[PDB]
Amino acid sequence: MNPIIYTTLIMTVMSGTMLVMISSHWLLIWIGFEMNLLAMIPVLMKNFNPRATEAATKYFLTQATASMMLMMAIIINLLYSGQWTITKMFNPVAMTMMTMALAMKLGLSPFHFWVPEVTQGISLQAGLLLLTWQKLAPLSVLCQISQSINPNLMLTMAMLSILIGGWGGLNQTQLRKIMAYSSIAHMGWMTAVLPYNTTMTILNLLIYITMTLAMFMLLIHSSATTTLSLSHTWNKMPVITSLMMVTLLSMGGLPPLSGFMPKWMIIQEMTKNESIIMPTLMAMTALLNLYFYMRLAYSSSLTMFPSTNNMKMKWQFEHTKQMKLLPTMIVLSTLVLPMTPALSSLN
Amino acid sequence: PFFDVQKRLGLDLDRWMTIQSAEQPHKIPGRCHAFEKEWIECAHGIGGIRAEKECKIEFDDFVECLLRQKTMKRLSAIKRQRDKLIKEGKYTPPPHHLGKEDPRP
Amino acid sequence: MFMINILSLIIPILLAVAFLTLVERKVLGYMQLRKGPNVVGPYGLLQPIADALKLFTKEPLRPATSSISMFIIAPILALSLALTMWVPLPMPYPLINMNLGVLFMLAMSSLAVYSILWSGWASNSKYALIGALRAVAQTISYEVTLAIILLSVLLMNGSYTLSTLITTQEHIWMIFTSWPLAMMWFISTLAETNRAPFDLTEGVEYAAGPFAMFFMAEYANIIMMNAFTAILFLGASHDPHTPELYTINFVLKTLALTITFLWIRASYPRFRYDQLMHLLWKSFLPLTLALCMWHISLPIMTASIPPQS
Amino acid sequence: LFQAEKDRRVLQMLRENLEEEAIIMKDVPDWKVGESVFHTTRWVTPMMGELYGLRTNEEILSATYGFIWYT
Amino acid sequence: MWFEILPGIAVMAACLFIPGMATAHIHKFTNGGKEKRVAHFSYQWNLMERDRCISGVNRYHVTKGLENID
Amino acid sequence: PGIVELPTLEDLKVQEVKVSSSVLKAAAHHYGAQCDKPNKEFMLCRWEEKDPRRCLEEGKLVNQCALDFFRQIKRHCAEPFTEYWTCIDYSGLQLFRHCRKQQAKFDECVLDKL
Amino acid sequence: MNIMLTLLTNVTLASLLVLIAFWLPQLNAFSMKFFLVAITFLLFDLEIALLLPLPWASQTNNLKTMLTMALFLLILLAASLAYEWTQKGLEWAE
Amino acid sequence: AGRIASFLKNAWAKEPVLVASFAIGGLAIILPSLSPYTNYAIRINRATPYNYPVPLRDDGNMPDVPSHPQDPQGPSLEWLKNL
Amino acid sequence: TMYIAFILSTIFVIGFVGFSSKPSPIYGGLGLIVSGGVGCGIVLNFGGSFLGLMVFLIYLGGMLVVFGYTTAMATENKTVFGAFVSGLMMEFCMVYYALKEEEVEIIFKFNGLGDWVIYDTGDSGFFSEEAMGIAALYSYGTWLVIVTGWSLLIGVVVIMEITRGN
Amino acid sequence: MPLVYMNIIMAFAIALAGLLMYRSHLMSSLLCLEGMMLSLFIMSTLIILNTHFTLANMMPIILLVFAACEAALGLSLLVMVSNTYGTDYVQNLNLLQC
Ligand SMILES: CCCCCCCCCCCCCCCCCC(=O)OC[C@H](COP(=O)([O-])OCC[N+](C)(C)C)OC(=O)CCCCCCCCCCCCCCCCC
Ligand SMILES: CCCCCCCCCCCCCCCCCC(=O)OC[C@H](COP(=O)([O-])OCC[N+](C)(C)C)OC(=O)CCCCCCCCCCCCCCCCC
Ligand SMILES: CCCCCCCCCCCCCCCCC[C@@H](O)O[C@H](CO[C@H](O)CCCCCCCCCCCCCCC)COP(=O)(O)OCC[N+](C)(C)C
Ligand SMILES: CCCCCCCCCCCCCCCCC[C@@H](O)O[C@H](CO[C@H](O)CCCCCCCCCCCCCCC)COP(=O)(O)OCC[N+](C)(C)C
Ligand SMILES: CCCCCCCC/C=C/CCCCCCCC(=O)OC[C@H](COP(=O)(O)OCCN)OC(=O)CCCCCCC/C=C/CCCCCCCC
Ligand SMILES: CCCCCCCC/C=C/CCCCCCCC(=O)OC[C@H](COP(=O)(O)OCCN)OC(=O)CCCCCCC/C=C/CCCCCCCC
Ligand SMILES: CC(C)NC(=N)NC(=N)Nc1ccc(Cl)cc1
16 A cells, blocks of 8 residues: 555544544544544554455444434424534434444444454454544544433443453453453443543543553554564563553553543542442453463563574664554553642633 | 534534524525524533533424424324325315315415 | 327327438438439429338238237337427426436437347347347447446536426537537447448338338437527527527437538448447547546536536 | 515415314314414414415326426 | 449438437427427426416417417 | 414415416516516515415405506507517527517507506 | 336337247346446446536536636546556556 | 656647546636636626525614615625626 | 325335345346336436436446446346345235324324425426526535545546556 | 324334344344334425425435444445355354354
């Protein structure tokens, strides 16, 4: 792919998301979604191989079905209200269809399989962009339409997402599938807190994006896509393994790291509204995520797996490409707990 | 979520198309222009919760103009009663409804 | 009376198709220094009848490995769409006066593309299928070009009404106004109708009766295209009290255009497939877009925007 | 002139329909004659069904499809 | 010679004359010797309906005038 | 909610202008020039009241003005007007372009008489 | 109604002729280059669909804006054609 | 100007169709801006009456609003008549 | 009345049932063509002449032609008949319910009295409201034109890149 | 709401169900995807024309354009998959596992 074409497609994806986030018209929001998907498909199919083609095909099918459902919901809402402005939807059936379409776009359970499938199919940069941006946009739409969301359905989908992410991450071995299930669990947390405080939703989004960027960029730096491939990193650059370990600890919600702040704020907000059982179950279920994070950290940082012989040549040579904002994302993902009251600024 | 660039910069990207009581080409009015205008003027500036709680008469009038559910129900009831009456033969249509009348210019 | 009008529109078209076959044979003969059919009837005025009778009383060869549904539908669709495109044409009064007649013609042509694909896929033969695919590609490309040209021309008419076209051409000719568009329109109509130099398909499975259906559909399409071109670029003067003058003039212009079709077929060699494909996308399409821009800008810069009504 | 004629025709048709409704629905337990379905007292443009509900099928078809089917 | 092509062209012209002439004759016959009304717009359709109503014989082409009003 | 008030059929009766569209279109500019005041009053009433029931008297006045206008035309220029609207009626579109002679004669007649 | 009757008559006559001709003697007893043409045709057809409502758009009072938008659409169509030309999407080499 | 002149000369001998298309497009883009009749076209489009001219209630402070269609006040299409 | 629009809608649903039962790609394409023609008839009968002709032209001539063209250049059961029968039975049951009374037990509430009843007595003059609204895409709708053109150009680039291979 | 809207919504639901129930081919899935857009276009144009929403008449055209672009993208993906595997069967798309 030509660099000019690649940057044009990236800017088209970003422009589609910006159009979705700045448009007050349902037709314009749908147009932004269509543009985002259209420009996103080649980014997935950059490195051409049958696995990438299959991942792109599955992603296209899922996103097209979600877009059709979203347009149907828009039309149904227009039928009973005659309004195009994105506000509290005036029809429960249209609201349910919109919620299901946005859940399918985000990856919430039971619409989650395509997330690990595509993430394994595509490369690390494609997975990073996919997760981050393609979860950034529908969450903005949901935050705009929050006041009409059915709490029962939203919380059911959120809890299912958390459980499914935990169990999938427990069983998986591939780094990209682990990241996909982590994304599913964090989206579950965000959508669980969504019907109560969109500010907490945005805070969780920002923290999750920072941690995911840090983890994916560390994986790109180490050029590891499996557990055993990552197990050789300690013999070439042990600093990266330690940074990855602290990032994994933060993603598990362990205090006093940055990952504990979203869970803490969400628990507080949900327990303000006389909801105890849901926060308790959500907090207890994150232990599965922390378990597979710790299992991944054992193989890379806290132990020394056997190495190979060409690693000496690896030592002789030096990394050339420099990651952008990697130290900043590492610091922001582990040491911003004492700056929690900035959520008022985020408000 | 919603960065109101249109309101910040004074643009009109889609607010012209948002509602059907706005400026239409050749001043073509909508089907329910009056009802929508009344609902908007009732609900403006009081917030979503108060708009839903208070402008219920206006919203119901707008929805009735849009869908014509109650009017269709009333017409169907009248038609059903007329059909039942003419089945027994008690009621007979007038000449104009029967088809022998002079229309109006 | 409407059924009488429909029949008066339909049957003379088929008779004209048959005698157009006869006229094409005679004109080709006289251009090639031969004489053409002058034996079957007086000056050969029984050859279409003899050919029709033979093709009807000829044995068919329907393949065993063929979809009978498509094999029957394709000629029916082709003939129906060939006959349908005559109802909005004014001469001087259309049978069905439509506010948007041009879009109806475009839709009818686009549907008429389906006949080639269905006939190719009905034979269940690989080579006929490949030929049908190439024909479909050529037809859709020249459909794009025809649509852009027809959009460009009607910007000086004000609407999609052929009666309004006549009113516009009351004074002078759209061929005088926009002759490059006339050139490209004529060439694109040739390519769409698959006449020489664009008869790549004929340069097979159907025989006997069903073949005659396709032949009649193609010749009716040729006559309809010539009549449409005559109306669009060679508008005649219409007198409301004596409409027959316009009918005579329109028929003469249509005959002249069809005779020009036959003349070109006799005169010129055949294009290659890739050569004719490059002829459009690299020579006609850029000029068509430029002329579309020019014809959009011209009424605004000269304050000559046609009336909507 | 056409606006006045249209208003007069619409009012006459509405009055005829009201009289026929009063004649027919004279035995329903609770049925007000001429009752509106809107909370407002503002004039509402009559629907096509409100005008041609009780008339002949030929007139109904003419009123609903005459302009569409005329070519 | 080349004029032997004329009989076929003559037959083609005779065949192509029939549609337009027949359509014009039928339009004049079914409308009382006048061109068929072109109702391209709702205003024209309303005019036709008003003409039919004022004629009262259920024919829009039966025109009435000053002798009808007074 | 509420009962729709409708005028009775007795007050909805008025002498209609029983002329065809061709006749109306032939005498269109003159009709608009001569009966401008009642027509404008009725249109203003309709656009301000937004209710057909509130402007019946204006409609009756419009009908009366139209009838007076047509009677005045018939008293003086009945034959030129008849020729003009016969010429207009023939055209399917009822164009003014094809009757520039009958229109000229009618305009000469009305200018000299009225 | 008239158009429906005309279509029915045309279809009926075509079917009758086809069936008469069929039974009168029967008395008794992926190429990638070809695919890209279809996609390019579809995209240009969508552009044509956008460009169709031009005759009515010339009657508006915002003539400058309408002209700018029409020229913008045509320039984008030309740019798509030029991009395909330069990237060899119109080549029939093999 | 030698290089551009040579480029135009070569293009006019190798791709005359492309040269003609680009020239036509350039003229189409530029000419309407540098034309005096665009304002006339806009005025003609604005002068065409589609909707009914709903009258105004007289208040005694409308000197420029005519009281009759034939009154000298109000817009005049004399420019369109002589065009 | 004659319930012409209702009959057209029923035919539309039947064609959809067939093409969703999917006996084969070609037969499904033909059923989709039939359903598109029926929908164009529905919108034309309602009064959207330009939109109906636009759907006809675009959908059938360009969109379903390329589908068949791709299918024709590839050439690569009791379930279909069972699905078709089930769909026909469901549609007939819904039609019978709606005709007998207001079928409100569905997620929506439907009242059947007439598509002529649901119409309005308003009318325009010397212009088409649909045509003017669609032509307002240039006077108004400047943003829509820009975003749609950019989307089309990006789609051209996308289909160029994906089919490249490598 | 009248019965025409009911039939259009039922057609959309049937098309959606057909897409979600694959049989052998990916082409049939794309066909079912395009039927949903046809139903959406019909519903949108009926709603807009019924309420005389003049400025909304341009929405169905934009919807049709974007959905046709999506259809072209899907056809490109389908032909790439067919060139890779030999058939357009959805059974071959199983290299990636959940
Ligand atoms: C094999 C493929 C077949 C595909 C199609 C299968 C289904 C066919 C469905 C037919 C629907 C008919 C719709 C029109 C109904 C009447 C509406 C009406 O009055 O419209 C007035 C309008 C008037 O035109 P207008 O647009 O000028 O209207 C404005 C002017 N006023 C309002 C004054 C009338 O008529 C039309 O628009 C005419 C075009 C109709 C297009 C739809 C029918 C296409 C038929 C050809 C395709 C099918 C051929 C099959 C051949 C045999 C194959 C085996
Ligand atoms: C096979 C060799 C063909 C050689 C060329 C034949 C056509 C000659 C025209 C130039 C070449 C073709 C260019 C494209 C078509 C141009 C059409 C054109 O201009 O046509 C001109 C005339 C019609 O144009 P016109 O001059 O009559 O129309 C006037 C138009 N207004 C009023 C708007 C200014 O048509 C013909 O000459 C017909 C030629 C084909 C038919 C040949 C057989 C008939 C011979 C003449 C019979 C005359 C009596 C007929 C009955 C009269 C009853 C009252
Ligand atoms: C609008 C469509 C019109 C189509 C026709 C237009 C042109 C018509 C030209 C016809 C000129 C007359 C032809 C006469 C040919 C010779 C007739 C005769 O020789 O044949 C007889 C039998 O032939 C027929 O009976 C004559 C048929 C003449 C033509 C009839 C009209 C053409 C049919 C039109 C069909 C149109 C629909 C088809 C469209 C494709 C056998 O006679 P025979 O055994 O030796 O008797 C001994 C000879 N003697 C008496 C001199 C001693
Ligand atoms: C203001 C600061 C902007 C900063 C960001 C700029 C870049 C953002 C991305 C591009 C945004 C384009 C802005 C579109 C807003 C449209 C509204 C504005 O432009 O008014 C229009 C004015 O029309 C003008 O002609 C501008 C048309 C749009 C600009 C020309 C095309 C630019 C395309 C840019 C993107 C191209 C993508 C592909 C690049 C190759 C519409 O006119 P309108 O008010 O309603 O009615 C007529 C009233 N008039 C007569 C007084 C104007
Ligand atoms: C250079 C390109 C040529 C290659 C491609 C050409 C393909 C042609 C294949 C030739 C095989 C012949 C069968 C295919 C056409 C079938 C035509 C047909 O069905 O005709 C039926 C009809 C039957 O008689 P009726 O008219 O119905 O009754 C009155 C009797 N007097 O006509 C006949 O007489 C034909 C009957 C016998 C002919 C069939 C005998 C040969 C069959 C062997 C199988 C060959 C199939 C070919 C496979 C092609 C792919 C390898
Ligand atoms: C003497 C002239 C007087 C008038 C002069 C006025 C100014 C004229 C300016 C003309 C600009 C010059 C353009 C000509 C150069 C075009 C490039 C060229 O020469 O051809 C190369 C090559 C063709 O060669 P091939 O046969 O395909 O391959 C050969 C293999 N051995 O061209 C290309 O690569 C494509 C480049 C152009 C793409 C055209 C696509 C459609 C664009 C035209 C639409 C016009 C829109 C108008 C907009 C204008 C404002 C932007
Ligand atoms: C191009 C060659 C094969 N054609 C002919 N010389 N005549 C022709 N196909 N025969 C014919 C004549 C009239 C009719 Cl209605 C139908 C078919």
